């Protein structure tokens, strides 16, 4: 797709889980079930505005579910809870 | 002949070592388990992958699997306790 420097997919949303966080635990799986309803709004948002970039939900669990789905970028040390946009919204200055 | 006369001492030593093995079983039964990384304190969260820092340096990380491992010389049952106490009595690896 153009306006995207990589391969994407509007069919669903991708989930990023940090290496230190085990996928398939009770905390993650419960967080990974109710977040599946975010995909409907993800597609609805793009329908109104086709020129829309990444929409991401950074969970306090640790996993980030973003749309559209796209394969992730050595080892990966990415944690959504340390990103500047997550920290600025978690608390006031 | 020297072996035959000794046996009274061997019997007492074996009995005392068996009693000490039973006491060690009562004490450290299954308590010697540990995870591959010193951050998970139970098998329920000692699963998946984790980031290991080689030689303690923060700038050299590497991905490793974490396994809920058990000590080689444990006190899980009576025979294991007897073997561990024998290795201790030989003064080898007893500080560990
Ligand atoms: C969290 O996980 C739950 C377990 O998978 C999901 O619950 C399941 O959702 C299915 C999709 O609707 C349900 O299937 C149908 O549900 C309707 C609603 O009552 C009924 O017609 C039937 O139960 C069923 N239809 C069939 C089988 O033809 C499951 O019943 C339902 N429960 C299960 C599988 O135990 C949740 O949807 C999920 N949460 C989110 C936000 O996705």
């Amino acid at each position: 797709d153009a306006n995207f420097g990589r391969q994407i997919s509007y069919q669903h949303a991708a989930v990023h889980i940090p290496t230190d966080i085990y996928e398939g635990s009770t905390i993650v799986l419960n967080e990974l079930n109710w977040t599946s309803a975010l995909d409907e709004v993800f597609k609805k948002n793009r329908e109104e505005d086709p020129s829309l970039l990444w929409q991401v939900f950074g969970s306090a669990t640790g996993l980030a579910r973003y749309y559209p789905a796209s394969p992730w970028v050595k080892i990966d040390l990415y944690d959504v809870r340390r990103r500047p946009w997550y920290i600025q919204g978690a608390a006031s200055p | 002949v020297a072996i035959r006369t000794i046996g009274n001492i061997m019997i007492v030593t074996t009995l005392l070592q068996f009693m000490f093995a039973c006491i060690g079983v009562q004490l450290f039964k299954g308590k010697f388990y540990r995870c591959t990384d010193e951050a998970k304190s139970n098998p329920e969260e000692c699963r998946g992958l984790f980031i290991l820092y080689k030689d303690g340096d923060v700038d050299s990380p590497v991905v490793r699997e974490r396994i809920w491992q058990n000590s080689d010389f444990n006190f899980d049952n009576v025979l294991s306790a007897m073997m561990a106490l024998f290795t201790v009595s030989t003064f080898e690896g007893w500080p560990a």
Side-chain angles (χ1 to χ4, degrees):
Chain A
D1 189 58
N3 70 79
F4 269 112
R6 50 199 300 149
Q7 45 195 11
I8 60 156
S9 176
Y10 303 119
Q11 272 311 101
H12 40 275
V15 173
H16 171 262
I17 300 152
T19 304
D20 283 86
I21 284 188
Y22 173 53
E23 81 270 49
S25 79
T26 298
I27 299 144
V28 157
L29 285 174
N30 274 314
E31 195 85 288
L32 205 59
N33 196 66
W34 74 262
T35 43
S36 295
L38 281 171
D39 305 2
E40 302 133 9
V41 187
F42 278 156
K43 306 198 183 71
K44 204 209 172 305
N45 277 2
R46 189 199 151 267
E47 286 181 358
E48 273 166 287
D49 203 332
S51 78
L52 191 43
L53 285 189
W54 307 112
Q55 320 164 57
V56 49
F57 173 66
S59 304
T61 297
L63 53 94
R65 169 181 290 259
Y66 57 93
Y67 185 88
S70 184
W72 199 250
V73 307
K74 39 195 181 299
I75 72 187
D76 167 76
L77 307 177
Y78 186 92
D79 201 359
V80 80
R81 307 173 279 192
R82 302 202 72 119
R83 293 306 280 163
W85 57 272
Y86 185 97
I87 284 152
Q88 84 158 1
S92 294
Chain B
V1 166
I3 273 161
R4 162 183 323 132
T5 70
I6 271 177
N8 284 356
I9 297 297
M10 295 181 206
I11 286 174
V12 180
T13 54
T14 307
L15 197 76
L16 289 181
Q17 205 248 331
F18 173 76
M19 302 186 358
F20 266 104
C22 281
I23 299 170
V25 162
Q26 296 305 325
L27 281 187
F28 324 104
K29 186 173 49 184
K31 310 189 160 51
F32 281 11
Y33 280 82
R34 87 187 42 214
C35 190
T36 309
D37 60 330
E38 40 171 3
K40 315 283 138 189
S41 51
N42 43 357
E44 300 97 31
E45 72 189 355
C46 179
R47 299 183 279 167
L49 302 185
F50 84 99
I51 298 280
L52 179 55
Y53 293 89
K54 295 171 102 97
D55 289 298
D57 185 72
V58 72
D59 265 43
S60 77
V62 59
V63 186
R64 290 294 156 80
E65 179 101 22
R66 36 186 173 208
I67 318 164
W68 191 244
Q69 263 151 358
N70 192 4
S71 188
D72 286 294
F73 296 109
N74 43 72
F75 293 79
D76 270 12
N77 52 71
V78 163
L79 292 186
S80 286
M82 301 204 48
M83 180 156 84
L85 285 187
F86 179 76
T87 60
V88 160
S89 89
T90 64
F91 289 165
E92 292 312 310
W94 89 262

mmCIF file of all heavy atoms in Angstrom, chain B residues 72-96:
data_model
loop_
_atom_site.group_PDB
_atom_site.id
_atom_site.type_symbol
_atom_site.label_atom_id
_atom_site.label_comp_id
_atom_site.label_asym_id
_atom_site.label_seq_id
_atom_site.Cartn_x
_atom_site.Cartn_y
_atom_site.Cartn_z
ATOM 1 N N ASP B 72 20.344 -30.111 40.948
ATOM 2 C CA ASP B 72 20.847 -31.441 40.617
ATOM 3 C C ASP B 72 20.860 -32.345 41.842
ATOM 4 O O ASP B 72 20.541 -33.537 41.745
ATOM 5 C CB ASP B 72 22.244 -31.335 40.011
ATOM 6 C CG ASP B 72 22.223 -30.822 38.587
ATOM 7 O OD1 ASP B 72 21.695 -31.532 37.705
ATOM 8 O OD2 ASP B 72 22.734 -29.708 38.349
ATOM 9 N N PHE B 73 21.225 -31.802 42.997
ATOM 10 C CA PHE B 73 21.244 -32.538 44.259
ATOM 11 C C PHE B 73 20.193 -31.909 45.168
ATOM 12 O O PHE B 73 20.454 -30.920 45.856
ATOM 13 C CB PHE B 73 22.632 -32.509 44.886
ATOM 14 C CG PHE B 73 23.675 -33.208 44.068
ATOM 15 C CD1 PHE B 73 24.655 -32.487 43.410
ATOM 16 C CD2 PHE B 73 23.666 -34.585 43.944
ATOM 17 C CE1 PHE B 73 25.611 -33.126 42.651
ATOM 18 C CE2 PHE B 73 24.619 -35.231 43.186
ATOM 19 C CZ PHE B 73 25.592 -34.500 42.539
ATOM 20 N N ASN B 74 18.999 -32.486 45.165
ATOM 21 C CA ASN B 74 17.868 -31.980 45.925
ATOM 22 C C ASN B 74 17.481 -32.976 47.013
ATOM 23 O O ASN B 74 18.123 -34.011 47.204
ATOM 24 C CB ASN B 74 16.689 -31.690 44.996
ATOM 25 C CG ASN B 74 16.478 -32.779 43.968
ATOM 26 O OD1 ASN B 74 16.034 -33.879 44.292
ATOM 27 N ND2 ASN B 74 16.802 -32.481 42.717
ATOM 28 N N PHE B 75 16.412 -32.645 47.733
ATOM 29 C CA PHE B 75 15.878 -33.466 48.812
ATOM 30 C C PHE B 75 14.434 -33.856 48.525
ATOM 31 O O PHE B 75 13.605 -33.946 49.431
ATOM 32 C CB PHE B 75 15.978 -32.739 50.151
ATOM 33 C CG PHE B 75 17.387 -32.528 50.629
ATOM 34 C CD1 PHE B 75 18.164 -31.509 50.111
ATOM 35 C CD2 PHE B 75 17.929 -33.345 51.606
ATOM 36 C CE1 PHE B 75 19.457 -31.313 50.551
ATOM 37 C CE2 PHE B 75 19.221 -33.153 52.049
ATOM 38 C CZ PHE B 75 19.986 -32.136 51.521
ATOM 39 N N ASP B 76 14.120 -34.088 47.249
ATOM 40 C CA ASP B 76 12.738 -34.348 46.854
ATOM 41 C C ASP B 76 12.215 -35.640 47.469
ATOM 42 O O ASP B 76 11.092 -35.683 47.982
ATOM 43 C CB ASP B 76 12.630 -34.390 45.332
ATOM 44 C CG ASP B 76 12.326 -33.033 44.732
ATOM 45 O OD1 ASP B 76 12.423 -32.025 45.462
ATOM 46 O OD2 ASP B 76 11.991 -32.973 43.531
ATOM 47 N N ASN B 77 13.012 -36.705 47.428
ATOM 48 C CA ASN B 77 12.655 -37.970 48.053
ATOM 49 C C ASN B 77 13.832 -38.457 48.891
ATOM 50 O O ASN B 77 14.859 -37.783 49.007
ATOM 51 C CB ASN B 77 12.238 -39.016 47.010
ATOM 52 C CG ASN B 77 13.254 -39.179 45.902
ATOM 53 O OD1 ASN B 77 14.339 -39.717 46.114
ATOM 54 N ND2 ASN B 77 12.904 -38.721 44.707
ATOM 55 N N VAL B 78 13.673 -39.641 49.484
ATOM 56 C CA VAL B 78 14.678 -40.143 50.416
ATOM 57 C C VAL B 78 15.983 -40.458 49.694
ATOM 58 O O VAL B 78 17.068 -40.127 50.182
ATOM 59 C CB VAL B 78 14.134 -41.366 51.177
ATOM 60 C CG1 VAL B 78 15.268 -42.146 51.816
ATOM 61 C CG2 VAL B 78 13.137 -40.925 52.233
ATOM 62 N N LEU B 79 15.903 -41.093 48.521
ATOM 63 C CA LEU B 79 17.117 -41.461 47.796
ATOM 64 C C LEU B 79 17.901 -40.228 47.360
ATOM 65 O O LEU B 79 19.137 -40.203 47.447
ATOM 66 C CB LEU B 79 16.761 -42.325 46.588
ATOM 67 C CG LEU B 79 16.212 -43.719 46.890
ATOM 68 C CD1 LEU B 79 16.046 -44.515 45.607
ATOM 69 C CD2 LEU B 79 17.109 -44.456 47.871
ATOM 70 N N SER B 80 17.201 -39.198 46.881
ATOM 71 C CA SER B 80 17.872 -37.960 46.500
ATOM 72 C C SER B 80 18.543 -37.310 47.703
ATOM 73 O O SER B 80 19.656 -36.783 47.594
ATOM 74 C CB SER B 80 16.873 -37.000 45.858
ATOM 75 O OG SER B 80 16.531 -37.422 44.550
ATOM 76 N N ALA B 81 17.874 -37.333 48.858
ATOM 77 C CA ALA B 81 18.471 -36.789 50.071
ATOM 78 C C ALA B 81 19.719 -37.565 50.468
ATOM 79 O O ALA B 81 20.720 -36.972 50.885
ATOM 80 C CB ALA B 81 17.451 -36.801 51.207
ATOM 81 N N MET B 82 19.676 -38.895 50.356
ATOM 82 C CA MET B 82 20.845 -39.706 50.680
ATOM 83 C C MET B 82 22.007 -39.384 49.751
ATOM 84 O O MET B 82 23.154 -39.263 50.195
ATOM 85 C CB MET B 82 20.492 -41.193 50.613
ATOM 86 C CG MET B 82 19.378 -41.612 51.557
ATOM 87 S SD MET B 82 19.417 -43.357 52.006
ATOM 88 C CE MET B 82 21.139 -43.564 52.435
ATOM 89 N N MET B 83 21.729 -39.234 48.454
ATOM 90 C CA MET B 83 22.795 -38.895 47.513
ATOM 91 C C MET B 83 23.379 -37.515 47.805
ATOM 92 O O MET B 83 24.605 -37.337 47.792
ATOM 93 C CB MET B 83 22.277 -38.966 46.079
ATOM 94 C CG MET B 83 23.324 -38.623 45.033
ATOM 95 S SD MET B 83 22.980 -39.350 43.422
ATOM 96 C CE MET B 83 21.854 -38.136 42.740
ATOM 97 N N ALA B 84 22.519 -36.529 48.073
ATOM 98 C CA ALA B 84 23.000 -35.186 48.374
ATOM 99 C C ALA B 84 23.836 -35.173 49.647
ATOM 100 O O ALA B 84 24.884 -34.518 49.706
ATOM 101 C CB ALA B 84 21.823 -34.222 48.495
ATOM 102 N N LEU B 85 23.392 -35.894 50.677
ATOM 103 C CA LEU B 85 24.151 -35.941 51.919
ATOM 104 C C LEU B 85 25.459 -36.699 51.751
ATOM 105 O O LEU B 85 26.445 -36.371 52.413
ATOM 106 C CB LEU B 85 23.305 -36.563 53.026
ATOM 107 C CG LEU B 85 22.213 -35.656 53.592
ATOM 108 C CD1 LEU B 85 21.564 -36.300 54.793
ATOM 109 C CD2 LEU B 85 22.782 -34.296 53.956
ATOM 110 N N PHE B 86 25.496 -37.708 50.876
ATOM 111 C CA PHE B 86 26.762 -38.369 50.573
ATOM 112 C C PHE B 86 27.734 -37.402 49.909
ATOM 113 O O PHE B 86 28.914 -37.331 50.279
ATOM 114 C CB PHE B 86 26.516 -39.586 49.682
ATOM 115 C CG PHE B 86 27.769 -40.318 49.295
ATOM 116 C CD1 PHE B 86 28.411 -41.145 50.200
ATOM 117 C CD2 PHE B 86 28.302 -40.184 48.025
ATOM 118 C CE1 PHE B 86 29.562 -41.821 49.847
ATOM 119 C CE2 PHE B 86 29.452 -40.858 47.667
ATOM 120 C CZ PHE B 86 30.082 -41.677 48.578
ATOM 121 N N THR B 87 27.247 -36.633 48.931
ATOM 122 C CA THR B 87 28.109 -35.651 48.277
ATOM 123 C C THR B 87 28.591 -34.598 49.268
ATOM 124 O O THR B 87 29.723 -34.112 49.167
ATOM 125 C CB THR B 87 27.378 -34.993 47.108
ATOM 126 O OG1 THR B 87 26.202 -34.329 47.587
ATOM 127 C CG2 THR B 87 26.986 -36.032 46.070
ATOM 128 N N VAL B 88 27.740 -34.226 50.227
ATOM 129 C CA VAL B 88 28.160 -33.306 51.281
ATOM 130 C C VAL B 88 29.235 -33.944 52.153
ATOM 131 O O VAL B 88 30.241 -33.308 52.492
ATOM 132 C CB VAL B 88 26.943 -32.861 52.113
ATOM 133 C CG1 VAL B 88 27.381 -32.327 53.466
ATOM 134 C CG2 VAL B 88 26.141 -31.816 51.360
ATOM 135 N N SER B 89 29.045 -35.213 52.523
ATOM 136 C CA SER B 89 29.993 -35.898 53.395
ATOM 137 C C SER B 89 31.340 -36.098 52.717
ATOM 138 O O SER B 89 32.358 -36.252 53.401
ATOM 139 C CB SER B 89 29.422 -37.244 53.837
ATOM 140 O OG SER B 89 29.757 -38.264 52.913
ATOM 141 N N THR B 90 31.370 -36.108 51.388
ATOM 142 C CA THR B 90 32.642 -36.134 50.679
ATOM 143 C C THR B 90 33.289 -34.757 50.579
ATOM 144 O O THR B 90 34.344 -34.635 49.947
ATOM 145 C CB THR B 90 32.461 -36.719 49.278
ATOM 146 O OG1 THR B 90 31.597 -35.869 48.514
ATOM 147 C CG2 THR B 90 31.860 -38.109 49.362
ATOM 148 N N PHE B 91 32.678 -33.731 51.177
ATOM 149 C CA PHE B 91 33.226 -32.372 51.208
ATOM 150 C C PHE B 91 33.406 -31.803 49.804
ATOM 151 O O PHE B 91 34.341 -31.047 49.537
ATOM 152 C CB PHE B 91 34.547 -32.320 51.980
ATOM 153 C CG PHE B 91 34.395 -32.498 53.461
ATOM 154 C CD1 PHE B 91 35.493 -32.790 54.250
ATOM 155 C CD2 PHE B 91 33.157 -32.372 54.065
ATOM 156 C CE1 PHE B 91 35.360 -32.955 55.612
ATOM 157 C CE2 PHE B 91 33.018 -32.536 55.427
ATOM 158 C CZ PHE B 91 34.121 -32.828 56.201
ATOM 159 N N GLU B 92 32.505 -32.164 48.894
ATOM 160 C CA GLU B 92 32.555 -31.681 47.519
ATOM 161 C C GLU B 92 31.250 -30.978 47.190
ATOM 162 O O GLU B 92 30.179 -31.588 47.262
ATOM 163 C CB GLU B 92 32.816 -32.827 46.540
ATOM 164 C CG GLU B 92 34.201 -33.428 46.671
ATOM 165 C CD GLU B 92 35.286 -32.372 46.713
ATOM 166 O OE1 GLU B 92 35.291 -31.484 45.837
ATOM 167 O OE2 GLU B 92 36.134 -32.426 47.629
ATOM 168 N N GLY B 93 31.342 -29.701 46.828
ATOM 169 C CA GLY B 93 30.164 -28.932 46.485
ATOM 170 C C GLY B 93 29.198 -28.708 47.622
ATOM 171 O O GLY B 93 28.036 -28.376 47.378
ATOM 172 N N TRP B 94 29.642 -28.882 48.863
ATOM 173 C CA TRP B 94 28.760 -28.713 50.010
ATOM 174 C C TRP B 94 28.433 -27.246 50.300
ATOM 175 O O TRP B 94 27.322 -26.972 50.771
ATOM 176 C CB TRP B 94 29.348 -29.415 51.243
ATOM 177 C CG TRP B 94 30.270 -28.609 52.108
ATOM 178 C CD1 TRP B 94 31.633 -28.613 52.077
ATOM 179 C CD2 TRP B 94 29.896 -27.715 53.163
ATOM 180 N NE1 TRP B 94 32.132 -27.759 53.030
ATOM 181 C CE2 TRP B 94 31.085 -27.197 53.711
ATOM 182 C CE3 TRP B 94 28.671 -27.294 53.689
ATOM 183 C CZ2 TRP B 94 31.084 -26.280 54.759
ATOM 184 C CZ3 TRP B 94 28.675 -26.386 54.728
ATOM 185 C CH2 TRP B 94 29.872 -25.889 55.252
ATOM 186 N N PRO B 95 29.333 -26.274 50.069
ATOM 187 C CA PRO B 95 28.901 -24.873 50.224
ATOM 188 C C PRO B 95 27.782 -24.481 49.276
ATOM 189 O O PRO B 95 26.908 -23.687 49.648
ATOM 190 C CB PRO B 95 30.184 -24.078 49.949
ATOM 191 C CG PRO B 95 31.272 -25.013 50.262
ATOM 192 C CD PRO B 95 30.778 -26.338 49.785
ATOM 193 N N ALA B 96 27.784 -25.016 48.053
ATOM 194 C CA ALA B 96 26.714 -24.710 47.109
ATOM 195 C C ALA B 96 25.373 -25.210 47.628
ATOM 196 O O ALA B 96 24.369 -24.492 47.582
ATOM 197 C CB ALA B 96 27.030 -25.320 45.744
#
